[PDB]
Symmetry: C3
Subunit: 150 residues, 3 copies
């Protein structure tokens, strides 16, 4: 099984930035009613997609007391709960984060270690890459992710 | 086998919106020489891609009287006829549609049913998710798709 | 195993265009430190990502002599050496190039042939499709790629 997911968020100056579950020191951060963690959301959508379960907006509406105000890792762990209850064994996740700043290079080990811990995947099964937007989307963070299971 | 495909169309007020082979009531719809069904186009290219067969511009150009003016489902079914003839068995389709409006949530069931029917896949093998552009592409519909075969 | 990668470059007039390892006749070429070959960069990142090896800015800084002024095929072949050393057997590459001009259709045979030879894959395992940006990115080339191994 395969799943494909995307997420993007507007970045504004002076707001905290959350990526792969971690607070990343930054001059910019998500402008959103969620934590804006685009890695988390895209991976979450990919996992749900792999089982045709819907998407994060359908399954994690903030109108719902269980998810409102919560950080995005909660949604990802619920998604993995759901797909595991359906027999899933997650094998791999490969994703690309697109943002002009900050540079994620300095945080690469922590970021990957986070994804590995949260999805209980060995680090060679976590493929994380970073790109700038080259001026195409200077004010956003974008994430696109593929997951493989079974 | 795997294939990856993309498509996008400009959206204009008062044009019909076609997605996943359906008419979706909308204030905006594709401006294009096709029906602008981004979902079908992406899926069609992903299928063709999985066998190296080309892209929809190569195989279904509107200078070819067979294809000009045809709905995009026609192209999708021909792409599966072509891969099937080369031995493929489609297994899974996971795709993301990005558009600010209209909301596709209230049409999710219809949309997933349509893909399921057109591709002859069980609904747990149709992974459809929806995103807004968060202001990046407010006048476009975008689609990105992965397919899995055998 | 699977991997996903992306790349983009600004395009300027009076600049050579390299794609899929080839110089393409074009009125615009990448504005970039590298040769700006978005297809090769995306494919390289996808390969690296399939083994959790990092990304092209991590493995190929210009600060390392080995890589300075080097054409992108050197990066791609380094990344296949690395996954090959880990027992990988590349099975397929499927990627989408997005750019308004120049038209890539007239060069489809050459482009696919180049990828086939560089990655040592049969042509039906090279899935290449082309898209315009429909107005969204008129001065950039973008590339998004999935690789499948074993
Ligand atoms: N055209 C659209 C776009 C999104 N959506 C749903 O709207 C939700 C929220 O989309 P969004 O782009 O604002 O997502 P987030 O900010 O929650 O990351 C999705 O998860 C999809 O459920 C929709 O029904 N129709
Ligand atoms: N730079 C490009 C862009 C597109 N193309 C071909 O041009 C066609 C039409 O591209 P488009 O972005 O206008 O696609 P559609 O409107 O048909 O969805 C493709 O399906 C590719 O065959 C090309 O050869 N070179
Ligand atoms: N926000 C970001 C963006 C890119 N990067 C690293 O920055 C490098 C160069 O990014 P780029 O978008 O300029 O890539 P290229 O021009 O080399 O194709 C990478 O390949 C990623 O290592 C980062 O650490 N943090
Ligand atoms: Mg989000
Ligand atoms: Mg750069
Ligand atoms: Mg189209
Ligand atoms: Mg067009
Ligand atoms: Mg939102
Ligand atoms: Mg590049």
């Amino acid at each position: 099984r395969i799943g494909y997911g995307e997420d993007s968020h507007r970045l504004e100056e002076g707001r905290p930035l959350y990526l792969c579950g971690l607070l990343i020191p930054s001059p910019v951060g998500a402008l959103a009613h969620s934590d804006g963690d685009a890695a988390m959301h895209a991976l979450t959508d990919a996992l749900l997609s792999a089982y045709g379960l819907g998407d994060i907006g359908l399954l994690f509406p903030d109108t719902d007391p269980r998810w409102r105000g919560e950080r995005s890792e909660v949604f990802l762990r619920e998604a993995m709960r759901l797909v595991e209850a359906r027999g899933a064994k997650l094998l791999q996740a490969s994703l690309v984060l697109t943002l002009d700043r900050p540079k994620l290079g300095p945080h690469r080990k922590a970021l990957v270690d986070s994804l590995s811990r949260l999805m209980r995947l060995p680090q060679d099964r976590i493929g994380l890459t970073f790109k700038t937007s080259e001026g195409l989307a200077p004010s956003h963070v974008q994430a696109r992710a593929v997951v493989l299971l079974d």
